[PDB]
């Protein structure tokens, strides 16, 4: 079966065959499309074909398909599964696996970089203290004094689902949010609930607008423990504007390291429930979403005031005007401080080239248009005009429930 | 099977039950989502009729009435005898309004019940069509105070006698290929323009030549008509702050009028059914003016603003984009021609959604089309989960007639 995608700007037509290797569900049916929907303990039974599927892909990739090495490995994994109900990946397989989960991540526009991923094997970790040490090392390596390097740290896989390793933070670095008794919010409104948890767990909150949250780390299904990332490891960028001298006085700054820590990495049927990964920011994540969402720092008004735009009617587009300036400032600031960042034009242009390369060499590139198109200026970027097919390949990154909702407290 | 949609900005959750009346297909499967893809007898006919007549009679609190049963009976008889049937005026109007109501890619559906329906089913010739279309244009335009309208020509019979408006929209600008290798006018309309010339149009070869109508009646060959220039309201584009903006020589037409779609009501197909409302500014200022494959004016404007165009990261493109969209809105407002900005329009649609969930149990919506082409996430629709499904009556895409026409 063949599927075609068309770019409506260039009339370039691509043919997808890769989707034939798709696995899990989309959430859609012939009767309904759930394209804009944000969200959607394993037996040996289901486990061996998943292991075998993965190992076949791995051995194909190194051009050793059907080799004695391939066959021995299947044999080895098979026995280990029937003996122990699970199996351990070789280091090479883990690395291949982690890289491919990123390659497969249909919501990630940064995938041109997928083969350059530093994989830190933390499968020997046994305690929250050990997790903390690993994560510190990841932060320091990835930050690299502003010259950011993509990395992922992989903690031990799930066993019976009662000994899960989890990073409770949604991201390694985020700012605290505090609800005031008057209903106003200080800091990042999105993080109010998680901040309360941290506080309950013993965190002494400074209660400012940009307090870096402590790590809340769970090893082996035990109660999570709090750790503060050494401040000297947390790289931050004061936000200023190249033309507007008043922008610095807004008091804005942001952290340089975007690092997702709440997702589950599936490789060959195995589940890695703690697998924090990091790259570098695309400007709009901070400038559009973090700063300008009504549910976040929500600075559009203050900025527009300082620009003295006509704010009495939306049709003056004062919001769009301020939005652009804020995004210029974020890009300006990061560049001036020599902290790796990419603008939405560069990143989408590079994604289109990555995508075409993937079609040519791989027969497809699953992509979620809803997430790929940037949250400002969508149609002046090339991805807007690009038809995409969304499907799910493994290895993959999956959502998982938030740990505070499922954890059995030991006390 | 009962589905929830969440707004991630407001945490409001809505429960959709209306999707369980979905009929047509999405293109999606359990293995693959095609959400970003632009394009897709007597026995077949009566259940479709019944489905529609049932929803019609339900809408007027008369479900299971004798008038309901009698109508159903009459239609069944008429299909058995004639192989088709004719809609009552009331049914035609209900159907057209609901086709709009069901248009999942339309952000402007809060206006759906306020639609003027012109019944043009008595039309027999292309001259008749031209007259009806002029009248539509004049009514809809209303000296700048736009009113939504649809004109509905005779329904398909054996498919050999289709009425078609060959133009994709009632009002558009010609496109010509230059010996300079470049393109003059609207690049998207080169092919259609050549067909007009081929069919005898004397082209002015300007940058904003309003295309003639190419009208096909009763499956006959399409004929050419020029819309009376005085009925085509256009708006010169200026900026409230940049005096030089007027010098780009830009204008656009006030009436957005889609003319290439198929209206399906109760199994009947109306292949010629031009409809119109009023513009959302981004349509002109983002897509028409700034698409690289359209008028593509970003660089020209940017230079006039003297932005640093050396590096993408100065966001000069985004800056020019905003000003271009400011000028469009300002120009229409100044000339008192109805227009709506994307903030206002998307805010309206969120209200409409909540109404539809509250009173109908859902609202089919295509997020990919509903979210505006600029400033997506500072509009409320960005943060609104939407379920996309196909309800009938419906507007459907159909094959361009030049690939179909047996000349
Ligand atoms: C190196 C430069 C990278 C760039 C510029 C980039 C860009 C982005 C952006 C803008 C998003 C959307 C984020 C949001 O809206 O919340 C995203 C999502 C995502 N990225 Fe990438 N990324 C990079 C690296 C990585 C790496 C190293 C991985 C994994 C190894 C990764 C995996 C993912 C996944 C799984 C998502 C979707 C997560 C979700 O649903 O919340 N990315 N990326
Ligand atoms: C009155 C104010 C209206 C507004 C502000 C509005 C807004 C829009 C916009 C922005 C689009 C996307 C068009 C594009 O990007 O090319 C659209 C599409 C659409 N609209 Fe509405 N519209 C209005 C009236 C109407 C009316 C009166 C009808 C039908 C009677 C209608 C039915 C549709 C349909 C079927 C589409 C999809 C067209 C396509 O697929 O190309 N709209 N509308
Ligand atoms: C690997 C990676 C690269 C990149 N460019 N962005 C990301 C997302 C980073 C990120 C950091 N902090 C917070 C978030 N949140 C913002 C709020 N959003 C709702 C969820 C994601 C996301 C990850
Ligand atoms: C009823 C209606 C209301 C509205 N605001 N917009 C529309 C779209 C109208 C429209 C006018 N001219 C041209 C187009 N084209 C632009 C190019 N695009 C690829 C197809 C649609 C669309 C229709
Ligand atoms: C409801 C909708 O899916 C939601 O707002 C999505 C839209 N696209 C997105 N795209 C990115 N990159 N990140 C997001 O959080 C979202 N949110
Ligand atoms: C490939 C993609 O579907 C295409 O560029 C779409 C995206 N969203 C759109 N949305 C609207 N309203 N109109 C359009 O023409 C498009 N084009
Ligand atoms: Zn879908």
If you had to describe this structure to a student in words, what would you say it looks like?
2 copies of one chain form a homodimer. With 411 residues, chain A is of the alpha+beta class. Chain A has 3 domains: 159 residues, Nitric Oxide Synthase, Chain A, domain 1; 103 residues, Nitric Oxide Synthase,Heme Domain, Chain A, domain 2; 89 residues, Alpha-Beta Complex (Bovine Endothelial Nitric Oxide Synthase Heme Domain, Chain: A,domain 3). Helices cover 33% and strands 13% of the residues of chain A. The first copy, chain A, is globular and about 70 Å long. Chain A starts with a strand and ends in a 5-residue tail after the last helix. The interface between A and B is large, with 65 and 65 residues. The complex binds protoporphyrin IX containing FE (2 copies), ligand W64 (2 copies), 5,6,7,8-tetrahydrobiopterin (2 copies) and zinc ion (ZN). Chain B: Belongs to the NOS family. Chain B: It is found in: Cell membrane, Sarcolemma; Cell projection, Dendritic spine. Chain B: One of its GO terms (biological process) is response to peptide hormone.
């Amino acid at each position: 079966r063949f599927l075609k995608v068309k770019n409506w700007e260039t009339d370039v037509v691509l043919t997808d065959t890769l989707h034939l290797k798709s696995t899990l569900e989309t959430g859609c049916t012939e009767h309904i499309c759930m394209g804009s929907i944000m969200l959607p303990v394993r037996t040996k039974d289901q486990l061996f074909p998943l292991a075998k599927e993965f190992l076949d892909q791995y051995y194909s990739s190194i051009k050793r398909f059907g080799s004695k090495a391939h066959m021995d490995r299947l044999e080895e994994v098979n026995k280990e599964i029937e003996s122990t109900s699970t199996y351990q990946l070789k280091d090479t397989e883990l690395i291949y696996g982690a890289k491919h989960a990123w390659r497969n991540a249909s919501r990630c526009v940064g995938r041109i970089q997928w083969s350059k991923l530093q994989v830190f094997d933390a499968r020997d970790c046994t305690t929250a203290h050990g997790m903390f040490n690993y994560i510190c090392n990841h932060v320091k390596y990835a930050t690299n004094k502003g010259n950011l390097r993509s990395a992922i740290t992989i903690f031990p896989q799930r066993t019976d689902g009662k000994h899960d390793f989890r990073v409770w933070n949604s991201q390694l670095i985020r700012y605290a949010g505090y609800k005031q008794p008057d209903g106003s919010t200080l800091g990042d409104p999105a993080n109010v609930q998680f901040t309360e948890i941290c506080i309950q767990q013993g965190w002494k909150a400074p209660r400012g607008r940009f307090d870096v949250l402590p790590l809340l780390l769970q090893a082996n299904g035990n109660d999570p423990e709090l750790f503060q990332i050494p401040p000297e490891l947390v790289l931050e960028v004061p936000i200023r504007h190249p033309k507007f001298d008043w922008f610095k006085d807004l008091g804005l700054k942001w952290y340089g390291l975007p690092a997702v820590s709440n997702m589950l990495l599936e490789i060959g049927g195995l589940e890695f429930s703690a697998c924090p990964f990091s790259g570098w920011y695309m400007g709009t994540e901070i400038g559009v979403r973090d700063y300008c969402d009504n549910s976040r720092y929500n600075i559009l008004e203050e900025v527009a005031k300082k620009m003295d735009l006509d704010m009495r009617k939306t049709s003056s587009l004062w919001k769009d005007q301020a939005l652009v300036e804020i995004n210029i400032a974020v890009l300006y600031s990061f560049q001036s401080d020599k902290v790796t960042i990419v603008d939405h034009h560069s990143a989408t242009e590079s994604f289109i080239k990555h995508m075409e390369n993937e079609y040519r060499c791989r027969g497809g590139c699953p992509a979620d248009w809803v997430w790929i198109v940037p949250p400002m200026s969508g149609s002046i970027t090339p991805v807007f005009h690009q038809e995409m097919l969304n499907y799910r390949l493994t290895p993959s990154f999956e959502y998982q429930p938030d740990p505070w909702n499922t954890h059995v407290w030991k006390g």
